Scaffold this active site. Structure first.
Site, PDB file in Angstrom:
ATOM      1  N   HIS A   1       0.872  -1.173   0.000  1.00 35.42           N
ATOM      2  CA  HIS A   1       0.000   0.000   0.000  1.00 35.42           C
ATOM      3  C   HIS A   1       0.912   1.227   0.000  1.00 35.42           C
ATOM      4  O   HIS A   1       2.059   1.148   0.442  1.00 35.42           O
ATOM      5  CB  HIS A   1      -0.916   0.011   1.234  1.00 35.42           C
ATOM      6  CG  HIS A   1      -2.198  -0.736   1.035  1.00 35.42           C
ATOM      7  ND1 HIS A   1      -3.248  -0.670   1.927  1.00 35.42           N
ATOM      8  CD2 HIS A   1      -2.610  -1.548   0.033  1.00 35.42           C
ATOM      9  CE1 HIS A   1      -4.251  -1.406   1.484  1.00 35.42           C
ATOM     10  NE2 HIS A   1      -3.889  -1.951   0.335  1.00 35.42           N
TER      11      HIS A   1
ATOM     12  N   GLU B   1       1.132   4.142   1.810  1.00 36.00           N
ATOM     13  CA  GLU B   1       1.721   4.565   3.082  1.00 36.00           C
ATOM     14  C   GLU B   1       2.853   3.642   3.512  1.00 36.00           C
ATOM     15  O   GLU B   1       3.915   4.102   3.925  1.00 36.00           O
ATOM     16  CB  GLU B   1       0.682   4.575   4.213  1.00 36.00           C
ATOM     17  CG  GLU B   1      -0.639   5.245   3.899  1.00 36.00           C
ATOM     18  CD  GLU B   1      -1.645   4.277   3.322  1.00 36.00           C
ATOM     19  OE1 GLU B   1      -1.439   3.820   2.178  1.00 36.00           O
ATOM     20  OE2 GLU B   1      -2.642   3.970   4.022  1.00 36.00           O
TER      21      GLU B   1
ATOM     22  N   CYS C   1      -5.665   1.975   6.188  1.00 36.12           N
ATOM     23  CA  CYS C   1      -6.312   0.727   6.560  1.00 36.12           C
ATOM     24  C   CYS C   1      -5.691   0.203   7.852  1.00 36.12           C
ATOM     25  O   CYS C   1      -4.783   0.832   8.425  1.00 36.12           O
ATOM     26  CB  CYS C   1      -6.130  -0.314   5.450  1.00 36.12           C
ATOM     27  SG  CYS C   1      -4.450  -0.975   5.322  1.00 36.12           S
TER      28      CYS C   1
ATOM     29  N   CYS D   1      -1.770  -0.252   7.441  1.00 41.38           N
ATOM     30  CA  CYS D   1      -1.018   0.994   7.391  1.00 41.38           C
ATOM     31  C   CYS D   1      -1.132   1.789   8.683  1.00 41.38           C
ATOM     32  O   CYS D   1      -0.157   2.412   9.124  1.00 41.38           O
ATOM     33  CB  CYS D   1      -1.463   1.819   6.184  1.00 41.38           C
ATOM     34  SG  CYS D   1      -1.040   0.955   4.644  1.00 41.38           S
TER      35      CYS D   1
HETATM   36 ZN   LIG Z   1      -3.101   0.373   3.868  1.00 40.06          ZN
END
Ligand SMILES: [Zn+2]
Ligand SMILES: [Zn+2]
Lengths: 151, 151
Positions: free
Chosen positions: A53, A55, A83, A86
Site C-alpha cells: 500500500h 503509506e 487501513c 497501514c
Molecule cells: Zn493500507
RNA sequence: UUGACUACGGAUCAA
RNA sequence: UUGACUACGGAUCAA
C-alpha cells in the site's frame, strides 16, 4: 495555499501514477521539516505483495533515508484513510502526524471503523487530520472502480 | 496439535536467531500444504526498518514464493501474539489461520488489547490459536529484557 | 527523578 | 445465482 494542501497535491500525483499502472489510485508522501523525504503509490497488483500500500511503501522508504525505524518529526500525507495494516505501520514507525484525504467507511482504521492512531493502550498515538482535498482524492477512487467494473 | 508444536519449534529456533543478533527474540514460520514456505525473525534494529517484525517479513517472503499477495491455505506460526501492524498485515494478506505462542498483554492485537483478526467489519478474518510452546516463547523474551536492562 | 514494562528499555506507564 | 461496494471486483456485504 498551505503546505498541507501542497503536499497533498503531491500525494495525488502519486495516486495518479498508481492509476496509470492499473492499481487502486492511492498515493502517499512523507515530509520532515516541510521537506519531502519519500513518496509512493499503490503497487499491490504489480508486485503481488500484500503490504504494497502507498503509506507502507513510503514509510519504509523514509526509514531508509533517515537511517532509523523511528520516523520522529515526520508527517504522512495520504489520499485515502489508512487501513488496519497501514494504521498499525504508522504506530510502529511512530509517525507523529498523519494528514489524509478521503475517508474509507469500509476499511478505514484512522477514524471510520476505528482509530488505531488514537489508542490509549498503544505506546504511540498520532495527530490525525482528514478531509484535505478529499473531493479530488475521492474522485480518483470512484472513477477507478467505475472503469474497473465497466471493463 | 503435534503438527503445531513441530512448526512452532521452528519459529522458536528462528526466534533464537534474532536473539543472537541482539533483537527482541521473536520468530515466525508460514506453512502451506503442511510444508514450510517461509520463515523469519525480528530484524528491526539490524535493518532499522519499523516493519521488520518476524511475521511481517515471513509474510512478504511467503508472498514472493507464491507470486501472489493472497496467502490462501497458509498458516502463520509466530512465537508472540501479533502486534497491531502484523495483525493488520495478516488481514491484508488473507491468511486463514494464525498460531501464536506467548500472549502480549502490552501490545498484542490478536486477542489481548483487541483482536484485529476477528473483525466483523473487515473483509477477512482468521482462525486464531494461542499457547503453543507458550513457556519457551515467553522465556526468550523474559531473558532478553532482563539482560537488556542489566546490559 | 526514582520504579515497572512482552516486539529497544530512545516508546509507554506508575508514583 | 443476483446486486452493492472506497485499497482487485479472486475478498466482503445484501437480497
Ligand atoms: Zn493500507
Ligand atoms: Zn508485529
Amino acid at each position: 495555499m498551505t503546505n498541507d494542501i501542497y503536499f497533498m497535491t503531491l500525494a495525488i500525483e502519486e495516486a495518479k501514477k498508481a492509476a496509470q499502472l492499473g492499481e487502486v489510485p492511492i498515493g502517499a508522501i512523507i515530509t520532515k521539516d516541510d521537506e519531502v523525504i519519500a513518496r509512493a503509490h499503490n503497487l499491490r497488483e504489480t508486485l503481488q505483495q500484500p503490504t504494497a500500500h502507498a503509506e507502507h511503501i513510503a514509510i519504509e522508504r523514509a526509514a531508509k533515508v533517515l537511517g532509523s525505524w523511528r520516523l520522529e518529526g515526520c508527517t504522512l500525507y495520504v489520499t485515502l484513510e489508512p487501513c488496519v495494516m497501514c494504521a498499525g505501520t504508522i504506530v510502529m514507525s511512530r509517525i507523529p502526524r498523519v494528514v489524509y484525504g478521503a475517508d474509507d467507511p469500509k476499511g478505514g482504521c484512522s477514524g471510520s471503523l476505528m482509530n488505531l492512531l488514537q489508542q490509549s493502550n498503544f505506546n504511540h498515538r498520532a495527530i490525525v487530520d482528514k478531509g484535505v482535498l478529499k473531493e479530488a482524492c475521492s474522485t480518483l477512487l470512484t472513477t477507478f472502480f467505475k472503469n474497473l467494473r465497466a471493463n
